[PDB]
Amino acid sequence: MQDGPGTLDVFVAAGWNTDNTIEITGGATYQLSPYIMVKAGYGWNNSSLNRFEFGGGLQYKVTPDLEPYAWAGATYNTDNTLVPAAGAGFRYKVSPEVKLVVEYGWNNSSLQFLQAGLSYRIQP
Numbered sequence: 001m002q003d004g005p006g007t008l009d010v011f012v013a014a015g016w017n018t019d020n021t022i023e024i025t026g027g028a029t030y031q032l033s034p035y036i037m038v039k040a041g042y043g044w045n046n047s048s049l050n051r052f053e054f055g056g057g058l059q060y061k062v063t064p065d066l067e068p069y070a071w072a073g074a075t076y077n078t079d080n081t082l083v084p085a086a087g088a089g090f091r092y093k094v095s096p097e098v099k100l101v102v103e104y105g106w107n108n109s110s111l112q113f114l115q116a117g118l119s120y121r122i123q124p
Helices: none
Strands: 005-019 020-030 034-045 051-058 067-077 081-093 100-107 113-121
Touching: 005 100, 020 051, 067 100, 081 113
Parallel strands: none
Antiparallel strands: 005 020, 005 113, 020 034, 034 051, 051 067, 067 081, 081 100, 100 113
16 A cells, blocks of 8 residues: 555646637646545646636546546636636546546636546556
């Protein structure tokens, strides 16, 4: 036994908005427990400024790896600006060391963007 809380994982996520624009989003997450999860990364459309995402994920125990995914938090831009929002997705297992994720971000009267990517664990 060694792989205890504080596990680090790498995952990428690239999506686009109805506005017809592509945005890249990647980073890492901290695994403290199977209950709540932490997510921190940054994304932008290659054009000055940036967008820092800060919040947590949500998972459930049903199968070796199959449960809905929920993320909540706000986007802190270098412009000392924050934009609270939320989204929902699903966590499906593909390969032994590869997992698929699909979630969309939305909040109040606004457009909804779709995101698709994968995740990979660095430690056991």
